[model samples]
Target: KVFGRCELAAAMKRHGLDNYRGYSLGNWVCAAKFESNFNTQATNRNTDGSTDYGILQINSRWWCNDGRTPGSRNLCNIPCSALLSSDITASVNCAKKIVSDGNGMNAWVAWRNRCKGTDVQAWIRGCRL
Candidate 1:
């Protein structure tokens, strides 16, 4: 499923991401745009043989368990498939853990190169949040 920018913002906010880890709604939205273009079925296989799953493109390396990574930590304690669901709940929950894991939102390189320290409010400008 694909999400319009504001629609995703509202869903993230509903999941209590508002001011969570000090990232505004736009930060998440911007990251989502570059990471997977708001599509839930998005997935990428990393060179390390781990997979990135779903809209957030969450990596299976350390976050979610894909059952393919030999030393997978399953830090989020969720199946990687959970992130592939159209539902944003598990993705949001796992994201919170990743962000707070001493990396902030820099967990996603898209954020570091695109959304980092920039004005992301424009991404959700018309969302009426």
Candidate 2:
């Protein structure tokens, strides 16, 4: 699979399905859906500390240097977006090492899980926003 940034998003969705568990993928996807409608390119620049970036809605400043390309581990030091952009499978697998290892979901993973199947959304609504 030729991985671009958008391909990374699809890969995240695939990995999400592979990784989905109760109360995990569904909730995270719901949140990401609420936030970015499942768009990996999702970004929000806010002056009120509400800014976010990428499919995971990761704060780029927290994860990547401003204007940095996707691959550099120094600039995009978090998920290795550049690496992920090349091989979605390897990128997602690597990402799980950092994200789900007792730390829990990053933004993209969260969305895939949360927005996965429809059953959980009903439960989410029942719980109330």
lDDT of each: 0.92, 0.45
lDDT of 2: 0.45
For candidate 2, lDDT tens digit of each residue in 1-129?
A: 222333333455667633453344445445445655555555676564434554445544445544543332333354434432333343344445445445555345444455445464442343322
Q: Which candidate leads the pack in TM-score? A: 1
Q: Tens digits of per-residue lDDT for model 1 on 85-123?
A: 889999999999999999799889999999998899898
Local error of candidate 2 at residue 118 (angstroms):
12
TM-score of each: 0.97, 0.43
lDDT of 2 at 8: 33
- What TM-score does candidate 1 get on C-alpha atoms? 0.97
Best of the candidates, lDDT: 1
